[PDB]
Design a binder for this molecule. Structure first.
Ligand SMILES: Nc1nc2c(ncn2[C@@H]2O[C@H](COP(=O)(O)O[C@H]3[C@@H](O)[C@H](n4ccc(=O)[nH]c4=O)O[C@@H]3CO)[C@H]3CC(O)(O)C[C@H]32)c(=O)[nH]1
Ligand SMILES: [Cl-]
Length: 396
């Protein structure tokens, strides 16, 4: 059987089943979740977790909203911090520590992001960080060091693009790629508690990408993931989630490198955007289903489950104990990229945890970024539009 077929047979024989709704469509992230659940389900006397794929993360949020409307929610689901904020408006989530899950040793960065009015409502589960993916062969070919600064990165992309006759820094015109440039030019989304999308650092970040396209060193990827477009033209670099690691490794027909992000100066790496999700437990669940969730979340935070999940995927281990586990240690010793992903996870920024942030990042800010990059809209005009649409949505 496939792991999901094994899970189906475990759950059919179980006396209690806690549904976990997720947004892994496939690859290593889906297999790793399913392998974790198969192992959990073996340890239990007829108390199982049933993972239900709901599409991607946006389809998962839509399906969770319809579940509220329908009067029936799963026991558990994946949720970004902004989705926790939304589910909290409807009082829909159980505080994790009251459930009895032990959070000692969980990354403080990750714990802070799931803490709302001093109460933790999520267990950090699959937490990614952005890294610099690069073509080791093509940088060696032209004698280009891995860039350590934003200045070096831009200089490197121009040098390589000129030598190879095509733009070598590949990017998605989206909020996630925008965040990298915005944060590392000194930007912040909140000024005195107010969301600001059109600050000078935002204009500067979107201007840098637009100018990169015009000058021929930046290539907008508009169909598929960057790793699904490799092999069409010279590639030197992308800034992308750590959870893309297995997809890049399988796709690349070159020696793939991973580095820490280019920063303002060599004093420290640039900040990466933390993405991925937490698990949350719904108040609607039965006492028996809640007790399955408590055991499952304890298993998830066990050092071995962390070590296997993180090394299989490129997600960041969420516990200090994961790094002390021999399976983690053995993988890091044979693959210096796990340690690089972990080192980068120390230089980590978050987007706003606002209930409306899903809509804003994709439909408002993402659209301004696409207008400027794909339709040459003026960056300030595009972001001023985004800012007005965001203020109208927040006052609604
Ligand atoms: N709803 C909602 N989504 C959000 C929020 N903040 C960021 N994002 C999205 O999270 C993805 C990052 O989450 P992460 O778990 O790090 O990475 C994903 C996938 O990105 C990545 N993947 C999958 C296939 C592939 O060929 N390559 C690949 O890299 O693997 C993981 C599992 O799907 C961004 C990118 C996106 O997938 O297109 C959509 C963006 C938010 O606040 N809300
Ligand atoms: Cl976006």
């Amino acid at each position: 059987m496939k792991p999901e077929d094994v899970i189906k047979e475990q759950c059919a024989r179980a006396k209690v089943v806690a549904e976990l709704w997720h947004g892994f469509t496939g690859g290593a992230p889906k297999a790793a979740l399913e392998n974790l659940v198969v192992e959990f389900n073996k340890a239990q006397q007829g108390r199982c977790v049933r993972p239900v794929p709901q599409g991607g993360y946006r389809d998962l949020s839509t399906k969770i909203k319809a579940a509220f409307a329908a009067g029936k929610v799963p026991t558990m689901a994946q949720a970004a911090e902004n989705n926790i904020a939304l589910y909290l408006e409807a009082k829909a989530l159980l505080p994790i520590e009251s459930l009895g899950v032990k959070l000692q040793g969980v990354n403080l960065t990750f714990l802070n992001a799931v803490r709302f009015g001093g109460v933790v409502y999520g267990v950090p589960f699959n937490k990614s960080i952005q890294v610099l993916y690069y073509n080791k062969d093509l940088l060696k070919k032209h004698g280009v060091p891995v860039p350590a600064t934003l200045e070096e990165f831009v200089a490197a992309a121009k040098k390589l693009s000129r030598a190879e006759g095509g733009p070598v820094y590949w990017f998605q015109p989206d909020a996630s790629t925008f965040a990298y440039f915005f944060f590392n030019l000194g930007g912040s989304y909140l000024k005195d508690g107010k969301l600001v999308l059109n600050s000078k650092e935002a204009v500067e970040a979107l201007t840098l990408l637009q100018n990169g396209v015009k000058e021929g060193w930046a290539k907008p990827i508009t169909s598929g993931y960057i790793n699904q477009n490799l092999g069409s033209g010279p590639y030197a670099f992308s800034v992308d989630t750590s959870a893309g690691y297995t997809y890049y490794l399988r796709a690349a027909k070159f020696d793939l490198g991973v580095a820490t992000l280019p920063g303002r100066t060599k004093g420290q790496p640039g900040y990466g955007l933390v993405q991925g999700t937490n698990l949350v437990v719904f108040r609607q669940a039965s006492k028996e289903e809640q007790a399955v969730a408590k055991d499952f979340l304890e298993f998830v935070l066990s050092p071995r489950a962390q070590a296997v999940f993180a090394t299989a995927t490129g997600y960041v281990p969420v516990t200090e104990g994961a790094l002390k586990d021999p399976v983690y240690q053995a993988y890091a010793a044979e693959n210096p990229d796990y340690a690089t992903i972990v080192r980068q996870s120390r230089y980590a920024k978050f987007e706003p945890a606002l209930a409306e942030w899903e809509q804003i990042r994709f439909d408002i800010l993402g659209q301004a970024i696409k207008e400027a990059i794909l339709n040459k809209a003026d960056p300030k005009a595009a972001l001023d539009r985004a800012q007005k649409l965001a203020e109208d949505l927040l006052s609604s």
